Amino acid sequence: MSTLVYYVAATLDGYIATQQHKLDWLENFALGDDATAYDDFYQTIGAVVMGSQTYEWIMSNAPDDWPYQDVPAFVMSNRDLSAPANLDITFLRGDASAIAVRARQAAKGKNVWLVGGGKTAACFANAGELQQLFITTIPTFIGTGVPVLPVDRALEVVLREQRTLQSGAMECILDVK
Ligand SMILES: NC(=O)C1=CN([C@@H]2O[C@H](COP(=O)(O)OP(=O)(O)OC[C@H]3O[C@@H](n4cnc5c(N)ncnc54)[C@H](OP(=O)(O)O)[C@@H]3O)[C@@H](O)[C@H]2O)C=CC1
Ligand SMILES: COC1=C(C)C(=O)C2=C(C1=O)[C@H](CNC(=O)[C@H](C)N)N1C[C@@H]3Cc4cc(C)c(OC)c(O)c4[C@H]([C@@H]1C2)N3C
């Protein structure tokens, strides 16, 4: 069917942000020309899913430039949060299965991009709803920070592809189960 994919950038110790929710280690790093183009991945996406912390990061850091206007967007939270009334943004909560079929439908046969973050990704994985991961790994350790996938127990994956870029960053596709 349609794939729920976790496409994310992470440190070598498996963190997707500093403990203060900063991405200096990420944004200050030049992936290089030989990286897989962002567009080529985003072309395969028909919906995005997010937790509320990642939503608030994007709105505080790019308030006038929502990046996913091209697709519907589902933000999970237990608040009655509000989006600018002009943006394709829905707020859902609870069981991760219902959210996935809602998002897979809206994706129209394209994939659902689980942008994150960790807590949200783990909710889906614990529910057996996460099917693939695409990780860009930055050659750095930050010691502590936001965990990429805080699952409750060991989630094993099959390595389906891996590239090492000229800059030291790496890319891999992981299939769940
Ligand atoms: N480096 C990268 O490539 C990426 C980095 N990031 C970073 O990750 C950080 C945040 O990741 P994280 O800290 O894991 O927080 P999340 O982004 O996972 O948001 C977590 C929140 O989502 C809500 N939520 C999750 N599951 C459910 C559910 N089943 N039902 C209802 N609400 C739910 C809750 O919000 P509430 O409290 O509202 O209930 C929870 O606190 C941010 O700093 C972001 O910038 C994000 C994506 C990729
Ligand atoms: C592949 O390597 C990745 C690198 C090198 C990255 O910089 C980033 C990622 C990578 O995967 C991925 C997604 N890739 C993306 O290209 C877009 C930004 N979504 N990201 C997910 C998001 C959403 C977002 C949004 C905005 C507006 C950001 O402002 C720039 C931003 O930094 C971020 C980021 C981060 C950026 N978090 C919060």
Q: Where are the domains of the chain?
A: 1-177
* Kind and range of the H or E run holding 103: helix 96-106
Nearest bound ligand to CA 22? 1
Helix (H) or strand (E) holding 151: none
Residue 79 annotated in ligand binding: yes
Amino acid letter, residue 118: G
Q: Which SS3 state, helix, strand or coil, does residue 34 take?
A: coil
d(CA 30, CA 89) in angstroms, rounded, equals: 31
Is-contact 95 30, C-beta < 8 A? no
Query: CA–CA separation, 122 vs 176, rounded Å?
Result: 12
* 125 within 8 A of 156, measured Cβ to Cβ: no
CB-CB neighbours of 41 under 10 Å = 14
Instruction: List b or e across 99-112, with b for residues whose CB sees 16 or more CB atoms inside 10 angstroms.
Output: bbebbbebbeebbb
DSSP 3-state of 33: coil
Contacts of 93-100 with C-beta under 8 Å, sequence gap 24+, read 95/127, 96/123, 96/124, 96/126, 96/127, 96/129, 97/127, 97/129, 99/49, 99/74, 100/4, 100/49, 100/124, 100/127, 100/129
Q: How remote is the CA of residue 175 from the centroid of ligand 2, in Å?
A: 21
List the helix and strand counts (H, then E) for the chain.
5, 10
CA atoms within 13 A of residue 2's CA, in its CB half-sphere: 20
Ligand 2 contact via 55 beta carbon (within 6 Å): no
The three-point CA angle 71-21-60 to 5° equals 50
- CA–CA gap between residue 61 and residue 129 (Å, rounded): 29
Q: What is the dihedral of CA 99, 49, 131, 176, to 10 degrees?
A: -110
Helix, strand or coil for residue 163?
A: strand
* 8-state DSSP, 14: S
Known binding residue 120? Answer is yes
Report how far residue 43's alpha carbon sits from residue 134's, in angstroms, rounded to the nearest whole number. 15
Q: Which residues line ligand 1 (CB under 6 A)?
A: 8-9, 16-17, 21, 23, 26, 51-54, 57, 76-79, 93-94, 96, 115-120, 123, 146
State how far the Cα of 15 lies from the Cα of 67, in Å rounded to an integer: 22
- In 3-state terms, what secondary structure has residue 26? helix
